[PDB]
Structures are given as structure tokens and as C-alpha cells.
Amino acid sequence: GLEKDFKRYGDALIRTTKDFLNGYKNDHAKEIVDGFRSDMSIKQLVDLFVKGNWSAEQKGALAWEIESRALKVTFQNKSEKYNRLFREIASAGVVDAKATEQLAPQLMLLNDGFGGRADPLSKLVLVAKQLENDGQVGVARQLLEKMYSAAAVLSNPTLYSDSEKANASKLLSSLAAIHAKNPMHDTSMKVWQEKLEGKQALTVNGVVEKITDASANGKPVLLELDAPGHAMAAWAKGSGDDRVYGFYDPNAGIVEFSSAEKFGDYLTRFFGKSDLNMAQSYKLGKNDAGEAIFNRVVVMDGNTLASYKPTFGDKTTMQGILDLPVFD
Amino acid sequence: MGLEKDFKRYGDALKDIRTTKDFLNGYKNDHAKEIVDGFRSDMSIKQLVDLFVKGNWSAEQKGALAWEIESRALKVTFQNKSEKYNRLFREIASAGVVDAKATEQLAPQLMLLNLSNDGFGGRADPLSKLVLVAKQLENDGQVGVARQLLEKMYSAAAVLSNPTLYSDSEKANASKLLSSLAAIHAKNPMHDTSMKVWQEKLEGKQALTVNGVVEKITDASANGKPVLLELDAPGHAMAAWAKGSGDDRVYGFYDPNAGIVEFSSAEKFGDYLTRFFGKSDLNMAQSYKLGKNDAGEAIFNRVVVMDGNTLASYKPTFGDKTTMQGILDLPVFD
Ligand SMILES: [Cl-]
Ligand SMILES: [Cl-]
Ligand SMILES: [Cl-]
Ligand SMILES: [Cl-]
Ligand SMILES: [Cl-]
Ligand SMILES: [Cl-]
Ligand SMILES: [Cl-]
Ligand SMILES: [Cl-]
Ligand SMILES: [Cl-]
Ligand SMILES: [Cl-]
Numbered sequence A: 001g002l003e004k005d006f007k008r009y010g011d012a013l014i015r016t017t018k019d020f021l022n023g024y025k026n027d028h029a030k031e032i033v034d035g036f037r038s039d040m041s042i043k044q045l046v047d048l049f050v051k052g053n054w055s056a057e058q059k060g061a062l063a064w065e066i067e068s069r070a071l072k073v074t075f076q077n078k079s080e081k082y083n084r085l086f087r088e089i090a091s092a093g094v095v096d097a098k099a100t101e102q103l104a105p106q107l108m109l110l111n112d113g114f115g116g117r118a119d120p121l122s123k124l125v126l127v128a129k130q131l132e133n134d135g136q137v138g139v140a141r142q143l144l145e146k147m148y149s150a151a152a153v154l155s156n157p158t159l160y161s162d163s164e165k166a167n168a169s170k171l172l173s174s175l176a177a178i179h180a181k182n183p184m185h186d187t188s189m190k191v192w193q194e195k196l197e198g199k200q201a202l203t204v205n206g207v208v209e210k211i212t213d214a215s216a217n218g219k220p221v222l223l224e225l226d227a228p229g230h231a232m233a234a235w236a237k238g239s240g241d242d243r244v245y246g247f248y249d250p251n252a253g254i255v256e257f258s259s260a261e262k263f264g265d266y267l268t269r270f271f272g273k274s275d276l277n278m279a280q281s282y283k284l285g286k287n288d289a290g291e292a293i294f295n296r297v298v299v300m301d302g303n304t305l306a307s308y309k310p311t312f313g314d315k316t317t318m319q320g321i322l323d324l325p326v327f328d
Numbered sequence B: 001m002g003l004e005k006d007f008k009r010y011g012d013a014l015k016d017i018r019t020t021k022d023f024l025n026g027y028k029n030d031h032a033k034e035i036v037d038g039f040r041s042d043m044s045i046k047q048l049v050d051l052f053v054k055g056n057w058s059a060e061q062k063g064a065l066a067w068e069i070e071s072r073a074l075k076v077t078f079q080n081k082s083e084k085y086n087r088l089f090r091e092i093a094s095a096g097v098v099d100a101k102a103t104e105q106l107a108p109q110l111m112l113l114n115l116s117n118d119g120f121g122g123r124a125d126p127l128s129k130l131v132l133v134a135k136q137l138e139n140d141g142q143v144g145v146a147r148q149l150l151e152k153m154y155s156a157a158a159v160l161s162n163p164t165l166y167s168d169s170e171k172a173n174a175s176k177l178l179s180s181l182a183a184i185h186a187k188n189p190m191h192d193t194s195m196k197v198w199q200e201k202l203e204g205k206q207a208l209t210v211n212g213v214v215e216k217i218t219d220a221s222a223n224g225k226p227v228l229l230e231l232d233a234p235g236h237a238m239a240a241w242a243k244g245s246g247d248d249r250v251y252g253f254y255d256p257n258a259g260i261v262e263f264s265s266a267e268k269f270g271d272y273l274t275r276f277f278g279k280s281d282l283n284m285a286q287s288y289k290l291g292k293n294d295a296g297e298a299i300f301n302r303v304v305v306m307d308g309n310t311l312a313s314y315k316p317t318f319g320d321k322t323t324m325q326g327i328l329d330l331p332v333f334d
Helices: A002-011 A018-023 A042-050 A056-070 A080-090 A097-106 A119-133 A139-155 A162-180 A204-212 A260-271 A302-306 A318-323 B003-012 B021-026 B045-053 B059-073 B083-093 B100-109 B125-139 B145-161 B168-186 B210-218 B266-277 B308-312 B324-329
Strands: A074-077 A107-110 A192-196 A221-227 A230-237 A244-249 A253-257 A296-300 B077-080 B110-113 B198-202 B227-233 B236-243 B250-255 B259-263 B302-306
Touching (some): A002 A056, A018 A056, A018 B168, A056 B168, A080 A097, A080 B259, A080 B266, A097 A107, A097 A139, A097 B259, A119 A139, A119 A221, A139 A162, A139 A253, A139 A318, A139 B077, A162 B003, A162 B021, A162 B059, A204 A260, A244 A260, A253 A260, A253 B083, A302 A318, B021 B059, B083 B100, B100 B110, B100 B145, B110 B145, B125 B168, B125 B227, B125 B250, B125 B324, B145 B168, B145 B324, B168 B324, B210 B227, B210 B236, B210 B302, B250 B266, B259 B266
Antiparallel strands (some): A107 B077, A221 A230, A221 A296, A230 A244, B227 B236, B227 B302, B236 B250
């Protein structure tokens, strides 16, 4: 009978006064509400609230003890059988556009192919964040969705139109072009601002400071984190509450945070011995202090990299590749 | 290892023929072994490029070798992400103050839980309805209204569990949103007589099976109009819907356990729902204790064909002018 207990409570009401809201907290009723016990039932708590003269802060204390129990909504990881059924349906036969949106974020990429280091992906993810900072939306999440769609079209071409087979080959052949002609070696334009290696190499903390620097509010920070035969990306984009700090790894996929503190906690624990110890798994060397350092950290120039053309003769730019379609 | 030099020689041998319908028709699997003389399905990428460069081929013949080469050289394999990466993300996102951007990635991985006699019923009575209003609004142009409902509920619950980490304005918004779900349960819109939020109530001899729900949701006669169904099982409410038009039309299902699932394909939607309730896979029909029709087929105690427009304009709390659509726009942070 929690429904009848919540109606009598709601009718007994002040819920917007700063005197009430200050009392609306946990472990506070046991110190200002005479006749309160943390083993009481919702029914007993409502009886104590109605039968009794209370102050503004005192009504807020009981309000929290009542609402924290009556309006409680608990969350928990979804059971594996629901995820297994969704992946089985979404990965079967013809590619499902809407299903791929929900499936892409749960997958990881593997190796032959092109690079095997994810050379072109870390770069395209950085261009995508340059474009997202400038207003576009979900450019990086759609890059993974399109790659998954292109691969599916290339594996079962008999299930797609000639237009779709042409789009899939063009997108995948474009990733191979970025690897064949690495923009880092181009001499007509400099796609990088700085190339921190050797005695200038950065640690995970160095990358975190560069990404979370509060002086970059509104401007994008685009870094390519290079480890032996394994390339990753880190970035910052947006402004104010919309500013986001992210990290990309072919294994973990794309991870973003609104909090600079959570981003720093994630990256430190990702590479640190305290948790995943990825720094030693990707075989990072150490500086004279014994701190893990990246073989190279490239501070990219989003604008120059976005305008780079991987295939000579063709006018398709990096930004152009992120807009290449797969389906009509 | 020298696959990069083999792809450059290949790309140069095509200078467009890659966009001619004669080339694309030949660009298929199991087709080169029947039109390309001197082809063996045991050849290496290097041998395939040699056969492509050294040899005069037709439009369809270049497409066959192109597929055999690209299907191997441009191959990208996918796999489930390791659980340790998801565990690290959940640990960071669930610590201290709620992270707006992290909640966007976390919400879709969670499921909802509550009391048997909770402050809004242990059947998800108000959620199935709010999800249907959200789909009514999404059909009309709004975006991610249902995904943000779960993100806000997660944020409200977090604020209610750790109020000392949020402002008075935030604690007031969290209590207002959660108290609104309790209002929808206290005053069930299905019993309102000032407005009819439902079009039909299929029950008894008119009860639908899982296949019946699939036909109603995927029915091509709904053009670009929204189909909003509430699937009622003993003490457990779910939702099913169709929204959008053309390539954008989507078929979805909501269950507090499975969360929100959507498909562009009517066939995949049907395969998902059939296997969700069927004994062949999850067997949820027997878990939610569904009854059976004279044919022994599992049926829902009731399927409500909702009227998105009327339900969206319904006011759960009397005296207050907040509508169902208004609840989906209630804020949590400021
Ligand atoms: Cl065929
Ligand atoms: Cl912060
Ligand atoms: Cl597309
Ligand atoms: Cl020809
Ligand atoms: Cl866990
Ligand atoms: Cl405050
Ligand atoms: Cl009812
Ligand atoms: Cl049937
Ligand atoms: Cl969900
Ligand atoms: Cl919000």
C-alpha cells in the first residue's frame, strides 16, 4: 500500500523554499527529527510526517527519507542474454541501419588489411572531432557504423545494389589510401603542430594535462598517441558544459567524458598498473623517472589534416572521406 | 606483409571503370572462378594482383578479380569488446557527480529495477506510456526523446541517492521528475473519461500473439504514421512501436529488462520479438506468464493501440498543467 502512503504525503504539502531543500539530504533526519529510526517503513515515515508539527528543514529531512525510498529507481547492467539476442539479429543477413547504431559501440576492430596499427582510424577520428567542434554531430560514431556497413557489404555483395557495393569499396579503399600515403610524410602541407618524442616524449599525465587544459575552452585539442605497432587518439572539443574529453583505441573503442577529472581517472587507470596496465601491454618505454611514455604524441592541426587528400589525382579530402555514404 | 605495394599496383591498374554497371555486376563472390581463366580460390593477394595487371579483362571480369582482391585486402573484422573495458568505463561513470556525456554511453547498457508495490507500480506502467509519447514526438521531428528519458531518470536517481553532491535546484528537479512517474501511476490515463488516450483494447477472443503484434507494428498500411502499442502481461507492461517514413522508418520494442531496441528492418524486428518470447531462445512469454489462445499460442493479456496525440496532451497531476510531453522535457541539471 505504498500508493495510498504517497497520496497522503503529497497532500500534506514549501518544496521549493531554500529552508526545505537544505534539510532535503541523507543522514540528517536522525539528528533533527525527534522520534525517527532508520529502520522505519515508508508507512511509518509518512505517519511521523503527517502526525507532527515540523519546521521547513525538518519537513525536508523526512521528505528525503520518504522520497529516497518511495521514488527509488535502481539501475544495473543488462543481462548478457538480452545483448546476445540483439547482436545475433543485428549481425545477421542484410545490414540494419538503425540496429548498426546500437551495435557499433559494442564492437572492437581487429588487424593484413591496412596498417594493423589503426594508422588511418586514429587520424580520421581526430578529423571527425575537428568537424564536431565546428558543429557537425556524431561524425566519429558514424565512421565506425559506416566501416561496419562497408565490411558487411564487401562480405555479402549479392545482398546489395551496385551503388552500395561502389560506396563500400570507395570508403574501405580510402582507409587503405591514408595508409599508403601517410599524411605525416607530406611536404606540401604540415598536418601536425608538434611531434613529442625522445626527451620530449609525454607520459599519460602529460597527455591528460594537454587534453584537459582549461585555456583551450572552445578550441579542439587533437592528439595521436603512438605505441609500438598500435595507434590511439585523444581529444577535447566543444565549449562550457558541452566540452567533452575523449579517447579512442581499437580495443576499447570511443570513450568520452564531460568531466576532465573522470577523463584523467580513466586514462591513468587504463595505462596504469593499478588497473588495466595497458601501458605495459602496448609495450611503452619509460622516461628517466621510470614513468611510461608514448613512442610519439602528435599534436595535430585539425584544419590542415581535414583538407589533406590521401589519393593523388582524386579531390576527396579526409573530411570528404568522413562524409562518404554507404547506403542511399 | 607486402600487401601495401600490392594494393598500389592494383589501384594504378584502374586509371571511372569502378562505377560502370558492367564492372559492379561482376563485383560479387563465387563469380571469378567462372569468368576469369587462370583463377584459383587458393591464390594469395599478390598472385591475384599479378593476374589482374598481367592480363586483358572485360568490365565484368575486372569486377570479379576486384572483389576477390578487395574482399581480402580491405577486410575489416569486428568482435565483442572485452568486458574489462566496459567495467572500467562503468566504474568511472558511476563514481561521484553524474557525468552528462558519460551517461549518454552508460544509459543504453543499464536496465531498470524497483519494488513489487513501488511508488509507480512494479509493472513499468508509466514508462511504457512515456516511451510511446516519446516515439510520437520523435515521429513528429524531435530526436532522442526516449534515450534522454532514461538518461534523466538515471540522473534523477543518482541525485536522490547522493543529494549532498548537487544544488537545491537539482534536488528539486530530480524529485519533480520521479514524482511525475508516480503521478502517471496514481492517475492511470487509461481510466480518464475526459479524453480517450487509446484507439483499441485487443483482449479476450481478440487478444494478439507475438506474431499478431509484429504484423500490427510492421503493417505497411501505416505509411509515415506512428504505431504505438502497450503490451500488457500479468504485472508487467512493455511497449512496441513504428515511427518515421521510408528508409527512416524504425520498428522498436521496450522492456525494463531488455531496454529500448529498434530496427530499420521489419524482418529483423519480427525475428527479435519471436525469439524474445519464443521457447527457441529467451522464452520470455513463459517468464512473464503469458496465457495461451485456443491454438496454444502465447497471447498478451491486453494490447492497447494508443493515440500518441491524445496521450501526449494528458495531464497526470490534476490542477498542474504539466502534460506527458511536458514530463519528457522536465530538466534535471542547470
Ligand atoms: Cl548471383
Ligand atoms: Cl570536472
Ligand atoms: Cl549511409
Ligand atoms: Cl569492356
Ligand atoms: Cl562489474
Ligand atoms: Cl544551491
Ligand atoms: Cl489498466
Ligand atoms: Cl498468429
Ligand atoms: Cl535501453
Ligand atoms: Cl538534463
